[PDB]
Design a protein that fits this description.
Blueprint lengths: L1 E4 L5 H13 L3 E5 L2 E4 L9 E7 L5 E7 L4 E7 L2 E4 L3 H6 L9 E4 L6 H8 L10 H11 L4 H20 L1 H9 L9 H20 L5 E9 L5 E6 L3 H5 L11
Parallel strand pairs: 1-4, 7-8
Antiparallel strand pairs: 2-3, 4-5, 5-6, 6-7, 9-10
Family: Belongs to the ribosome-inactivating protein family. Type 1 RIP subfamily.
Catalytic activity: Endohydrolysis of the N-glycosidic bond at one specific adenosine on the 28S rRNA
Protein name: rRNA N-glycosylase
């Protein structure tokens, strides 16, 4: 399992958490020195448990599929909560079975559905350590609309930060003050599967992407990524989604 405590949290302790999260994900191979997530894992070993504590020490446990860093559901006291999608239903066969009751959330876990449920896009939701403290607190008691925004915060501050050093750094900058994600952050999130695929295809293609990936940079400028010498590949992405899952 991995854990993170908001009480006394700072950029260092958050960085330790994101490091633990990355290190908890199994891989047998690296592609261009980036860990390649597994095609599949059987049984309960597919799921990592993340124990998150709000500033008051209240806790939820979040189940993450280790092949794709997708959050499947979470346990808050004696109630489990899962996304309304087949991968999450499957997960509910393995994790939090000791919950007194199971609630299936009235949406799947994808960004489009969550934004619809929350009534706002990711672009308008501040993120940061305080936002994560809020998110944990919201998830403690069921409120589906509130939970959708909380989950948008949770996904970006855990999974997305694990995937991209830039996103981890963005959250560290927001340790004590939330701010909406940069356009670059949103771009990276949206591009993880594409980048993972192209980095894998570049092996066999002399480091060259079969298809360029378009990203927004730190300056808000749209840029084309065409090969593995790009800073996004050498110095940003930390985990690759396996092409078998794309
Ligand atoms: C590789 O990527 C860099 C951008 O980082 C670019 O300047 C260079 O022209 C690219 N080379 C090829 C062969 O695509
Ligand atoms: O399908 C994706 C993944 O779940 C991502 O990690 C979170 O948002 C969704 O759009």
């Amino acid at each position: 399992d991995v854990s993170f405590r908001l009480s006394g949290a700072d950029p260092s302790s958050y960085g330790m958490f994101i490091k633990d999260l990355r290190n908890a994900l199994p891989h047998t191979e690296k592609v261009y020195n980036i860990p390649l997530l597994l095609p599949s894992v059987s049984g309960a070993g597919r799921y990592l448990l993340m124990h998150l504590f709000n500033y008051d020490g209240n806790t939820i446990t979040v189940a993450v599929d280790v092949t794709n860093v997708y959050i499947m559901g979470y346990l808050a006291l004696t109630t489990s909560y899962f996304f309304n999608e087949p991968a999450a239903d499957l997960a509910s066969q393995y994790v939090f079975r000791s919950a007194r009751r199971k609630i299936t959330l009235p949406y799947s876990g994808n960004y489009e559905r969550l934004q619809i449920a929350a009534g706002k896009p990711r672009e308008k939701i501040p993120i940061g350590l305080p936002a994560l403290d809020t998110a944990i607190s919201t998830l403690l008691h069921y409120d589906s609309t509130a939970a959708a925004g909380a989950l948008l915060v949770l996904i970006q501050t855990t999974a997305e930060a694990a995937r991209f050093k830039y996103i981890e750094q963005q959250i560290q900058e927001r340790a004590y003050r939330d701010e909406v994600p940069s356009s670059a952050t949103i771009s990276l999130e949206n591009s993880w599967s594409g980048l993972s695929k192209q980095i894998q295809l570049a092996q066999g293609n002399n480091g060259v992407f079969r298809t360029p990936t378009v990203l927004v940079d730190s300056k808000g400028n749209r840029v084309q990524i065409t090969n593995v010498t790009s800073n996004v590949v050498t110095s940003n992405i930390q985990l690759l989604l396996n092409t078998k899952n794309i």
